[PDB]
Amino acid sequence: ATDMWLERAADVSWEAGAAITTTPGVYRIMARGILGRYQAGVGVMHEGVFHTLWHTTRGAAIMSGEGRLTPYWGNVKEDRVTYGGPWKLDQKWNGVDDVQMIVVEPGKPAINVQTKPGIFKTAHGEIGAVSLDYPIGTSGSPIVNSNGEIIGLYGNGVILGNGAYVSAIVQGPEAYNPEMLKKRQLTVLDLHPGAGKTRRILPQIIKDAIQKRLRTAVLAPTRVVAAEMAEALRGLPVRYLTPREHSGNEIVDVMCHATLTHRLMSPLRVPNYNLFVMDEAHFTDPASIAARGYIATRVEAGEAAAIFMTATPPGTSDPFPDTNSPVHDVSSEIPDRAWSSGFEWITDYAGKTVWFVASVKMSNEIAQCLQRAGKRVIQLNRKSYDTEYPKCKNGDWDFVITTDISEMGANFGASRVIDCRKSVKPTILDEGEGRVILSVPSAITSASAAQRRGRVGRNPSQIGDEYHYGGGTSEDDTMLAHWTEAKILLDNIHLPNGLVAQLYGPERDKTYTMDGEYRLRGEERKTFLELIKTADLPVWLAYKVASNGIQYNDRKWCFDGPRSNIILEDNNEVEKPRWLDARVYSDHQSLKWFKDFAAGK
Numbered sequence: 048a049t050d051m052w053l054e055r056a057a058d059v060s061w062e063a064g065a066a067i068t069t070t071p072g073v074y075r076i077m078a079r080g081i082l083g084r085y086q087a088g089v090g091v092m093h094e095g096v097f098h099t100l101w102h103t104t105r106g107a108a109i110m111s112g113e114g115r116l117t118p119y120w121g122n123v124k125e126d127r128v129t130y131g132g133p134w135k136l137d138q139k140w141n142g143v144d145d146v147q148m149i150v151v152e153p154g155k156p157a158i159n160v161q162t163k164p165g166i167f168k169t170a171h172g173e174i175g176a177v178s179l180d181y182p183i184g185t186s187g188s189p190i191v192n193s194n195g196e197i198i199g200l201y202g203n204g205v206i207l208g209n210g211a212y213v214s215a216i217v218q219g220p221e222a223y224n225p226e227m228l229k230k231r232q233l234t235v236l237d238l239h240p241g242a243g244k245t246r247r248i249l250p251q252i253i254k255d256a257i258q259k260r261l262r263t264a265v266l267a268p269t270r271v272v273a274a275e276m277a278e279a280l281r282g283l284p285v286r287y288l289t290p291r292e293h294s295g296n297e298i299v300d301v302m303c304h305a306t307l308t309h310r311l312m313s314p315l316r317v318p319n320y321n322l323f324v325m326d327e328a329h330f331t332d333p334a335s336i337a338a339r340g341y342i343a344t345r346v347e348a349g350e351a352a353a354i355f356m357t358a359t360p361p362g363t364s365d366p367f368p369d370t371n372s373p374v375h376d377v378s379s380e381i382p383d384r385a386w387s388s389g390f391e392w393i394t395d396y397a398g399k400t401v402w403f404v405a406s407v408k409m410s411n412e413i414a415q416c417l418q419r420a421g422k423r424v425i426q427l428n429r430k431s432y433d434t435e436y437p438k439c440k441n442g443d444w445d446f447v448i449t450t451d452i453s454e455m456g457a458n459f460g461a462s463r464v465i466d467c468r469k470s471v472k473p474t475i476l477d478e479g480e481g482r483v484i485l486s487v488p489s490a491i492t493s494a495s496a497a498q499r500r501g502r503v504g505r506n507p508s509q510i511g512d513e514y515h516y517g518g519g520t521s522e523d524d525t526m527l528a529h530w531t532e533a534k535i536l537l538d539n540i541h542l543p544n545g546l547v548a549q550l551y552g553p554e555r556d557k558t559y560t561m562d563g564e565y566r567l568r569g570e571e572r573k574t575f576l577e578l579i580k581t582a583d584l585p586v587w588l589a590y591k592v593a594s595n596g597i598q599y600n601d602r603k604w605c606f607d608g609p610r611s612n613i614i615l616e617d618n619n620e621v622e623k624p625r626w627l628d629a630r631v632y633s634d635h636q637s638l639k640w641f642k643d644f645a646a647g648k
Contacts, residue, residue: 050108050115051078051087057157059091061147061195067159069095069111069131073149073189076103086153089187090130091197097130099187100202100217104128126202126217140164140175140198140216141373143510146190148177148201153184167205167215175216177201190216223248225255228322233346233353235328235360239371240458240505244356245279245326252354253283253299256322261352262298264320266307266338268327268455270433275456276301276326305334311341311540312576321351327455328355329363329494333586336533339551341540348546358501362553363494366520370504374512381467381517383409383488385416394420399461401447403499405488406471407634414448422446427453430636451491454498463513466499468520473528473630475587483528483587483628493520530558532586538565539572567593574599582644588628605645614638 053074069092076088076099088103097109097116101123108117109130121128140146150158160179167174177190181201188201199218207213227234238244249265256263267273273289280301286293288302300318304325311317323342328335339361345351358368367376382390383405393400394417404410407428414424425435427449439447439459447459451470469488476482491499496516503512524530537548547563549555567575575593578584584592597604608625614632615621621642631641 048079048110050110051076051104052110053077053090053097053112056089056151057149059093059149059189059191059195059197061191061193062159064159065161068156069097073151073157075151076109076187078107086184089151089185089189089201091136091187091189091200093197094135096132096135098134098136098200099128099130100200101126101128102203103187125219136197136199136218138192138196138198139218140190140192142166143373144193146177146192146198148179148190149188150179150181150185150201151188152181164216165213167213172220175199175218176213177216178213180212181214223251225259227354228255228259228261228352230321230352231346231349233343233355235355235357237358237360238356240358240501241371241507245275249276249324249326249356250279250283252324253280253285257284257299260298261321262318263300263322263324264307264318265299265301266304266323266325267301268304268330268332268335270303271436272326272456273301273303304330304332304338308334308338308341308536308540309580311338312536314573319350320345323351323353324356325354326356328357329359329361329498330455331495331529333529333532333536336529336550336554337536337540337548339554340533340537341542341548343551344542344546344548348544359494359497360553361494361551363497364522366493366496367500368497370501371507372504372510372512374500374504374514376500377513377515379515379517381465381515382413382416383467383469385412393465394422396463398463399442399445399447399459400463400465401449401453401459401461401502402465403453403467404448404450405467405469406485407450409467409488410448410450414446417446417448424448451495453502454495457502459502461503462509464500464503464515466496466514466516468496468499468516468518470495472524473585473628474526475528475531480626481587481591482626483585483630485629485633490519490521492522492524496520525557528585528587534558534560535565535586535590538563539567539575565590571596582648583640584644585628585630588626588631591626602645602647 054077055072056075057073059072071092074090075086076090078085078087088099090097090099101121106118108115116130119129119131120133145161145163147159147161150160162177162179165176165178167176186201189197190199191197199216202215202217204212204214221237238248267276277287284297285299285301286297288300289306342353346353404413410426414426417424422445424446425438425444427435427447429452432452468491470491471488472486473483474486500514503514540548542548571593575589577599578589578592604625606623608623612624612627614623616638632638
């Protein structure tokens with residue numbers, strides 16, 4: 048005939064060895080010219096659909112065993128075409144793994160050939176590359192997994208450097224830019240942790256900013272990261288705000304997330320920063336959320352630019368983002384308290400481990416259990432971070448037990464992460480006057496879990512890191528306190544041109560009240576500022592005091608509250624307040640500060 052027909056060569060299977068020997072399988076695509084019969088290409092029948100390359104048939108019809116088929120779907124640029132329905136192959140090749148091509152060469156019987164593919168740097172991602180030279184009739188031969196799955200077809204190559212023939216597997220990243228520094232621009236970058244993130248990218252951002260002569264605000268989540276910024280930005284005009292001092296020329300200022308927020312609130316003027324850079328932009332600290340609110344507004348106004356640096360941007364719902372190196376994600380049962388037996392896999396592990404816990408109370412019971420097994424352990428909470436975190440660099444440890452704090456800029460030499468996927472959070476009850484409570488261990492956000500997971504898989508040379516998780520994730524964190532405390536902190540920030548600040552777009556849905564409701568009068572506002580600075584009170588509790596019109600000296604509210612609001616310690620009394628906030632009475636240390644504040648200060 049004029050049009051083509053099919054002849055079965057082999058099945059779709061992985062076969063042992065280097066070289067060996069609509070029914071599903073591999074078929075020769077045979078044609079007829081004036082000069083005789085030939086093989087036009089190869090194809091594979093899978094789930095009722097014949098798959099091959101567009102080049103093979105050029106849109107001709109194929110007679111199968113019984114009845115004729117014409118192209119159902121195709122793409123010239125992609126070099127793909129299907130017969131009898133849509134493209135049904137979707138399995139992808141994983142790097143560092145050998146695959147097997149089922150070679151159906153014109154005239155020769157079907158032979159399996161194992162090789163190791165290379166990589167092409169194409170326009171859309173990276174394209175796989177098989178280094179096998181075969182005559183054009185062989186085009187379309189399927190390439191299969193160890194599991195027998197088809198990961199693509201043998202296609203047309205590239206006419207390469209002086210002498211080469213590497214064929215592409217037919218099947219189917221970010222970059223920093225100087226144009227991001229333009230005033231109206233806000234870009235969310237995924238700086239890839241390791242030797243790439245803060246070693247080359249950040250210094251290059253600052254080098255650009257100084258040349259463009261922009262006054263820059265670079266923001267660290269904690270003091271530790273700010274010191275890492277001090278090492279990486281040596282030999283550049285830069286002022287380190289959060290405490291060798293400044294000359295008076297530098298236009299680049301390094302500070303904490305909170306440092307800028309507190310200054311933005313204070314009576315004095317705020318410098319007109321043309322550029323904002325924020326590392327660990329996913330930080331759910333009230334002063335971080337509010338800082339992202341202010342920045343997003345000035346960028347929207349055309350007064351400033353923004354670059355947010357985080358692996359998990361505000362709005363993420365993916366618990367397993369693509370890592371640098373391959374990782375094993377294992378669903379396992381994680382202890383919430385000490386254990387006397389079982390759990391051999393935890394203590395038998397030779398390398399270092401980072402265990403995430405729900406609370407400082409969970410950290411104590413688990414670590415006390417582990418040190419009884421002769422295991423060197425460091426405990427890391429929001430209290431003992433600056434002190435105990437630097438010890439982790441030494442390597443004198445087998446286990447690191449930590450709270451949610453470690454999600455923000457923590458470098459561990461560890462190979463395994465144990466995650467309970469829970470945490471104790473301050474939550475708000477709005478009924479009547481209000482109550483802030485420390486929740487029972489609850490399922491964290493998937494963005495937060497991906498940060499806990501992101502402690503491993505960083506090293507491009509170290510592969511197959513382990514990540515053990517127990518329980519699912521949850522996105523209903525609207526009940527939490529840090530949302531309201533942020534918009535309280537945001538309403539009290541002033542903007543010129545009769546403007547009021549608003550939260551960063553992706554986070555606006557979390558809290559909805561009158562915009563600028565929490566803005567306070569000249570005497571209340573100044574009193575509220577001293578309650579968070581001098582007295583170290585939670586933002587919610589400090590607002591309640593100032594809101595009603597209580598002065599900074601007047602301590603009466605601590606003793607004239609409702610009869611149900613009396614404070615307890617050891618099941619005994621303590622010498623209540625008008626409003627309750629668990630953060631000031633839950634543990635012995637903080638409760639001691641609250642009763643000093645109560646008595647006289």
